[PDB]
Design a protein around this nucleic acid. Structure first.
Length: 50
DNA sequence: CCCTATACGCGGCCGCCCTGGAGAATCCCGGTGCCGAGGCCGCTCAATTGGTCGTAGACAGCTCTAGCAACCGCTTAAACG
């Protein structure tokens, strides 16, 4: 519900070493399209999507 | 051999240098008078004490509306380099 908890999980996964992607209200629609097309690609190395 | 001028020491008088006792100016002390301040007394009115009573506000209860934290999404005009 809160993007600050999204920041907490994103920093946790960044220092963990897990390829993560994020989507919230601050992200513009072009980068949202980039994140969705990267996550839905068959050769995606992303594991967790926030 | 006696008189008379002649150069030489100096009794008396006057002026100058050194030291002593009497009086005057100054500091300290005691008695006394005046100004600032503190204490006491007299009046005396406003604060105190005691009681009574009304009520101002605290409290409780119910209803409706504004605010608030955190998020979204779109527009677009303002801020910024």
């Amino acid at each position: 519900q809160m993007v600050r908890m999204l920041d907490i999980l994103g920093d946790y996964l960044s220092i963990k070493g897990i390829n993560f992607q994020r989507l919230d209200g601050t992200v513009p629609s072009a980068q949202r399209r980039i994140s969705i097309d990267h996550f839905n690609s068959p050769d995606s190395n992303d594991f967790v999507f926030l």
